[PDB]
């Protein structure tokens, strides 16, 4: 199980840690932070320029290009690391591919006008994330009859939608979208059955780091969630998740080494 | 609904419990202060011993061990609602510990000193059976045989299975791969239908994997703890109580959403 982009590959026979690079002098700072994450063992850096704060204005395309593209460029021309770009905009997808981005990580699963066409044209790997609704209102009244089944249907549909637009299965990643239109119980139901998303035979990406599903469980603020975030990370990676998206790279990578040592000793190579 | 009973109280093993490790080195005030901190961090069991009772630690007379151990156990039993595990190999310390309110006998020698087995039987308290020996033909199968044997040995001495806890003894005569084989197959030790105790906190199986010193092993210890608890381990023995407890709460929320209630 591998991904291919920009003339290199990513071997997903073991879990990978994706370091969050939020870019919502900031370019030098971004590069310093990317460097630190790389040294800590991050093998993918997720550059993100539009925040998902519910009440917030969406950023203009011109602002998102300014924040994201120089950052992706700087990293591509300085380090060997893979680069994911956190955008929903066709122009940012195109421009990012041109400066060396490896993965389009769209929380909206290319639902923006032109997004699907633009991603198809880059030939890059694409991460499809479940979200119910949109970021402005998704957390008001998250509701599911069966949250696993509903997220699973969604993946079937979006995969079909990507293949129709000319994007091959082999470029797709799936992410259940923890905290995107989900209460606490919804999130833990998905984490508990995460292994069951392997039937698609596609890489699994998860981002639980410092999210509400830890905050609400422990009643702590965003800077007290490391231990819970690691637990989430380990729970996911023990079920064969391929990419773990986190703030605290060093600590996550240490935990993943322990998961790898455990999975290596297992005949199965997975828990369910 | 696995449950232990001791000293007129019970321990509900439908969820994982964190056992904090307490050092005994004035020292009695400090012990109680550290026990208090671990309880406030969410420890439901306190394992009295730590660095005074580690392998390689200086041996002591019966008289010295009673003097250092029994007051600590007594002080904790009087002040806190918590369960108390006592680290000792000596029959006298077993007897006296039970008299002052200890709940669990934790002997890393598996009651092999003369009289220890008999004394533990007499207390009626729960007893931890930990594997210790590095070289194995099949580490899981050998650790598993040892549990079969020690359970029989304990039942023959009059200690009912319902008082037994099984611990594979990470780091006790085990290289790195032996330790991860056992961790990987931990869930298979449930066929005994007995509680499972594990202690990986800051051990070599982390330090050697990550090549870090004893103080830089928290993240790896937490992963070990989560890996064990996801597999239905009932007690987790650690230095870092607060963080481990937070991780266990995540494990609990996950296992509650799970229909199975366990991974394997
Ligand atoms: N693929 C993928 N991309 C992601 N981007 C994010 S942003 C999120 C955060 O908590 O970082 C967030 C949510 C709300 C406000 C700010 C930031 N989360 C994911 C995820 O879970 N998967
Ligand atoms: N039941 C039970 N009791 C235990 N006592 C210990 S002492 C160990 C440590 O790392 O604390 C240790 C081992 C070697 C040297 C120093 C310290 N480990 C366990 C365990 O794994 N289970």
Q: Maximum CA pair distance of chain B?
A: 52
Q: Which of B219, B246, B256 sits opposite A251 (nearest CB)?
A: B219
Give the number of A-B residue pairs with CB atoms closer than 8 Å: 108
Catalytic site includes residue B237: yes
Neighbour count for residue A114 (Cβ, 10 Å) = 14
Burial of A95 (0-12, 13-18, 19+ CB in 10 A): buried
DSSP state string for A137-205: TTTSS---S-HHHHHHHHHHHHHHHHHHTT--GGGEEEE--TTSS--HHHHHHHHHTGGGGGGG---BE
Burial of B78 (0-12, 13-18, 19+ CB in 10 A): exposed
Neighbour count for residue B141 (Cβ, 10 Å) = 11
For residue A100, give the DSSP letter: T
Per-residue tokens: B226: 């989560």
DSSP state string for A79-91: ---EEEEE---HH
CB contacts, 8 Å: B16 with chain A: none
Pocket of ligand 1 (CB under 6 A): A 51-53, 86, 105, 107, 127, 129, 175, 177-178, 205, 207, 211, 245
Nearest-angstrom CA–CA distance, B159 and B161: 7
Q: Are B201 and B241 in contact (CB under 8 A)?
A: no
Taking CA atoms only, the protein residue closest to ligand 2 atom 17 is B54
Q: How close is the nearest chain B Cα to the Cα of A67, in Å?
A: 33
Domain containing B186 — which CATH number?
Answer: 3.20.20.20
The torsion angle over the Cα atoms of residues A18, A68, A51 and A162, rounded to 10 degrees, is -70
Q: How close is the nearest chain B Cα to the Cα of A199, in Å?
A: 18
Give the phi and the psi of residue B126 in degrees, each rounded to 5. -55, 145
Q: Are A122 and A173 in contact (CB under 8 A)?
A: no
Residue from B56, B237, B239, B240 whose mutation best tests the ligand 2 pocket (most atoms within 8 A of CB): B237
Give the phi and the psi of residue A219 in degrees, each rounded to 5. 55, 55
Q: Are B90 and B62 in contact (CB under 8 A)?
A: yes
Nearest-angstrom CA–CA distance, A115 and A60: 15
Q: Which of B185, B223, B264 sits opposite A230 (nearest CB)?
A: B223
Q: How was this structure determined?
A: X-ray
DSSP state string for A33-69: HHHHHHHTT-SEEEEE-S---TTPPPPPHHHHHHHHH
Domain holding A208, by residue range, is 1-272
Q: Is the CB of B55 under 6 A from ligand 2?
A: yes
Which residue, among B105, B131, B129, B108, has the nearest Cα to B119 in the 3D structure?
Answer: B105
Q: Are B153 and A234 in contact (CB under 8 A)?
A: no
Per-residue tokens: A136: 């402005």
Q: Are B39 and B80 in contact (CB under 8 A)?
A: yes
Give the 3-state secondary structure of residue B29. helix
Nearest-angstrom CA–CA distance, A167 and B175: 47
Q: Are B254 and B230 in contact (CB under 8 A)?
A: yes
Give the phi and the psi of residue B47 in degrees, each rounded to 5. -95, 105
Q: Maximum CA pair distance of chain A?
A: 51
Q: Residue A2 belongs to what H/E stretch?
A: strand A2-5
Residues of B with CB under 8 A from a CB of A: 176-177, 180-181, 183-185, 206, 209-210, 218-220, 222-224, 226-227, 230-231, 242-244, 246-251, 253-258, 263-264
Q: Are B155 and B188 in contact (CB under 8 A)?
A: no
CA triplet B264, A263, A179: central angle to 5 degrees?
A: 75
Q: Which of B219, B248, B257 sits opposite A254 (nearest CB)?
A: B219
The HSE-up count of residue A262 (CA atoms within 13 Å, CB side) is 32
Q: Which residues contact B122 (CB under 8 A, 6 or more apart)?
A: B95
Per-residue tokens: B35: 């026990």
Terminal-to-terminal C-alpha distance of chain B:
20
| Number of domains composing chain B | 1
Nearest-angstrom CA–CA distance, B253 and A213: 10
Q: What is the CA radius of gyration of chain B?
A: 17
Q: What is the layout of strands, in order, in the sheet containing A82-86?
A: A172-175, A126-129, A103-106, A82-86, A44-48, A16-22, A243-246, A205-206
Nearest-angstrom CA–CA distance, B178 and B175: 5
Q: Are A97 and A59 in contact (CB under 8 A)?
A: no
A interface test, pick of B223, B260, B262 with most A CB neighbours within 10 Å: B223
């Amino acid at each position: 199980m591998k991904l291919f982009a920009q003339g290199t590959s990513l071997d997903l026979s073991h879990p990978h840690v994706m370091g969050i690079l939020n870019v919502t002098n900031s370019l030098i700072d971004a590069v310093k932070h990317a460097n630190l994450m790389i040294n800590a063992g991050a093998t993918i850096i997720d550059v993100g320029g539009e925040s998902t704060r519910p009440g917030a204005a969406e950023v203009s395309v011109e602002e998102e290009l300014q924040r994201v593209i120089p950052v992706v460029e700087a990293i591509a021309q300085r380090f060997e690391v893979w680069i994911s770009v956190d955008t929903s905009k066709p122009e940012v997808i195109r421009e990012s591919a041109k400066v060396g981005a490896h993965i389009i990580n769209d929380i909206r699963s290319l639902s923006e006008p032109g997004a699907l066409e633009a991603a198809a044209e880059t030939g890059l790997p694409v991460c499809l994330m479940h979200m119910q609704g949109n970021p402005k209102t998704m957390q008001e009244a998250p509701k599911y009859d069966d949250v696993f089944a509903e997220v699973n249907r969604y993946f079937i549909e979006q995969i079909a939608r990507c293949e129709q637009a000319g994007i091959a299965k082999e470029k797709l990643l799936l992410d259940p979208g923890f905290g995107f239109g989900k209460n606490l119980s919804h999130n833990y139901s998905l984490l508990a059955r995460l292994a069951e998303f392997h039937h698609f035979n596609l890489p699994l990406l998860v981002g639980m780091s410092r999210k509400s599903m830890i905050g609400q469980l422990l009643n702590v603020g965003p800077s007290e969630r490391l231990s819970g975030s690691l637990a989430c990370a380990v729970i996911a990676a023990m079920q064969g998740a391929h990419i773990i998206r986190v703030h605290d790279v060093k600590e996550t990578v240490e935990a993943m080494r322990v998961v790898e040592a455990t999975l290596s000793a297992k005949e199965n190579k997975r828990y369910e």
